[PDB]
From a paper:
Two homologous tankyrases, TNKS1/ARTD5/PARP5a and [name]/[name]/[name], catalyze a post-translational modification, poly-ADP-ribosylation, of target proteins. Tankyrases are enzymes (EC 2.4.2.30), which belong to a family of proteins known as human Diphtheria toxin-like ADP-ribosyltransferases. Tankyrases control β-catenin phosphorylation through regulation of the stability of destruction complex by ADP-ribosylating Axin and therefore inhibition of tankyrases offers an attractive strategy for treating cancers with increased Wnt-signaling. Tankyrase inhibitors interact with the NAD+ binding groove of the catalytic domain and they bind either to the nicotinamide subsite, the adenosine subsite or span across both sites.
In particular, increasing the size of the para-substituent improved the potency in compounds 29, 30, and 31, all characterized by an additional ring, as well as in compounds 32, 33, and 34, having a branched side chain. This increase in potency is caused by the hydrophobic interactions between the para-substituent and the side chain of Phe1035, Tyr1050 and Ile1075. The most potent compounds were those characterized by a substitution in the para-position of the C-ring. Structural analyses revealed that the para-substituent improves the potency through hydrophobic interactions with Pro1034 and Phe1035 residues in the binding pocket of [name].
Numbering used by the authors:
A (entry chain A): 952 to 1112
B (entry chain H): 1115 to 1161
Write the structure that this text describes.
Amino acid sequence: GTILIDLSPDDKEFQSVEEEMQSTVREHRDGGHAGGIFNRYNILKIQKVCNKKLWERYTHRRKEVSEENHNHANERMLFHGSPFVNAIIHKGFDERHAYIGGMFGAGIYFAENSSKSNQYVYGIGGGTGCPVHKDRSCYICHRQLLFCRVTLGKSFLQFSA
Amino acid sequence: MAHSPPGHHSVTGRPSVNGLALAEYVIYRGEQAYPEYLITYQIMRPE
Ligand SMILES: O=c1[nH]c(-c2ccc(-c3ccccn3)cc2)nc2ccccc12
Ligand SMILES: [Zn+2]
């Protein structure tokens, strides 16, 4: 039930998503080991992901959270990188998309920095890099990230190195 | 998947060392995220 609709680069919606991608790149403490060495991206395509059943699954849970938190979903737009992007857009997020070994326990992780999520496109630690060239800093192979609507509700604050 | 801390719906990882890093977040229910945009891109080699 998932359809992908291309956004035109002339569309304000394309432009605001591209700006969030580009403007949230940062340098990483690994010097580029996991995600590659770069300051910006070449955006090739931005598609809207349309799935009625998955959207209703999201809004159902969003209302449950909001009602538990004085009518405040605390909804954010955040990046997600994963080897399982295809599974996610067709079947939805679930426990098989969790980072079992993450710093905050086994859950599904999202980043404000697009470059943080870029470190996970080829797996934890960048895995072995792109499938064609085995290069975590490949400048040739096309990568994909998701820009996701996320309900945080009441969020537990961890101060962390 | 783990559970959210009791009385909470997510965890926020606030950076406490790298002053330039932004926050990271964890949810423990897949129903709390919807993949609105699929972005296809390359990283660019710095000049
Ligand atoms: O976008 C992110 N993806 C991931 C990530 C990590 C692991 C996996 C994964 C999922 C299933 C099996 C193996 N690995 C999927 C996504 N971790 C992050 C951690 C911090 C901030 C952002 C992310
Ligand atoms: Zn490659």
